[PDB]
């Protein structure tokens, strides 16, 4: 079938829930109280209070 690694043709992007980045095991990035969840990129939510 299509080879998403070479063809483009991506899918499964909606399967990500969240991601976080951490330099030197202490510097949570971007930090600085920037985002609504400062320590991580919350891609999608199953419950939203």
């Amino acid at each position: 079938g299509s080879i998403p690694y070479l063809d483009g043709t991506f899918y499964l992007n909606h399967t990500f829930k969240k991601v976080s980045i951490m330099f030197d095991s202490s510097v949570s990035w971007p930090g600085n109280d920037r985002l609504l969840t400062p320590n991580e990129f919350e891609i999608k939510r199953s419950v939203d209070g």
């Binding site: 399967t15 939510r45 199953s46 419950v47 939203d48």
Partner: protein, 59 residues
Amino acid sequence: AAAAMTATRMPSSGSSPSVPSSIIAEEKLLALLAELEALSRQLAALTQQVSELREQQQQ
């Protein structure tokens, strides 16, 4: 924890017009107040001529 979590999970509003028909209007109004006087005038004229029997029978 997993499997289903991939998707997601008053008082009174006080209307008024309800289920009745439409409505219309016109401006040719109100002779009717005259008959209320016609009726009660002619009613007197009845009794007035009943009296005119009696006032001639009494002669």
